[PDB]
From Swiss-Prot:
Residues 92-101 have a biased composition (Basic and acidic residues). Residues 289-299 have a biased composition (Polar residues). The keyword Disulfide bond applies. It is found in: Cell membrane; Secreted. Keywords: Cell adhesion, Cell membrane, Disulfide bond, Glycoprotein, GPI-anchor, Immunoglobulin domain, Lipoprotein, Membrane, Repeat, Secreted, Signal. Interacts with PTPRG. The keyword Protease does not apply. The chain holds residues 596 to 898 of 1026 of the full protein. This is Contactin-4. Residues 90-115, 289-301 are annotated as: Disordered. Expressed in the region of developing olfactory neurons. Isoform 2 is expressed in mature sensory cells of the vomeronasal neuroepithelium and at lower level in olfactory neuroepithelium. One of its GO terms (biological process) is nervous system development. Contactins mediate cell surface interactions during nervous system development. Has some neurite outgrowth-promoting activity. May be involved in synaptogenesis.
Amino acid sequence: PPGPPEAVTIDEITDTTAQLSWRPGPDNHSPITMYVIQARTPFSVGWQAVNTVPDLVDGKTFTATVVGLNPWVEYEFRTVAANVIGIGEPSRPSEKRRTEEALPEVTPANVSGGGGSKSELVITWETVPEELQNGRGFGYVVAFRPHGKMIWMLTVLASADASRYVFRNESVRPFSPFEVKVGVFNNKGEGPFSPTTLVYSAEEEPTKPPASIFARSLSATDIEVFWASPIGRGRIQGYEVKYWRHDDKEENAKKIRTVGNQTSTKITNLKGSALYHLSVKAYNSAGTGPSSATVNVTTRK
């Protein structure tokens, strides 16, 4: 296998391209027939191969152009020569050198949203990776409009780390569809927008209480509670069961929550031969509804 090539230098650097040069290393009694070039950045995971011109570098070429680099990233480079035997030892790395800035080009992935409290529209996205921001002053532009309308409303978020925006206004009807895209910008200029997606605003909280509530004591620490769903009313994600010992204030109560359609539950780790008060509430992404009547049950022993 071949020895390490030497003297890797960065002769030119633009926003996405660099011109590199190097000098041959010992070939170890076998003809050197190829050079490959690797790059390392703070964000790459160690050394990676790069695209070059010529797309394949022979053993006679000691300089080459590297393409498809990220704007505004710090780069080191090294070269490796190859024999017929195998791949050689990597060179020592070149000096570090930062590419120039450019317009941003990558929009955030997984633009979505939903939920929230009354009068809200909740919009979420994944922050654009740092090696893809292409320059200082990187931020987002959240564009949203009611489905069926023409005017886009625009919010700027100066912070590259922003992953979430909440719009609240009386104009927002409950569970209404908005068209949503998220764009990017940096000091060099404005970049593209994500593909439009549909996001629904916050839904209405439950409006009716659970009915037909009662409980049964099983052991001295376990009771069972049953209710019926309300009739009419809102969407219901589960129930909040609220319980407290006869000797505590109601505001000291513990709460457990329920997910799905179960219209019953089981409370544990209670004190025996003691009275307990309970009440149930429906909830959804927007909050909780009215409370059932309070029911009274005593533990077994």
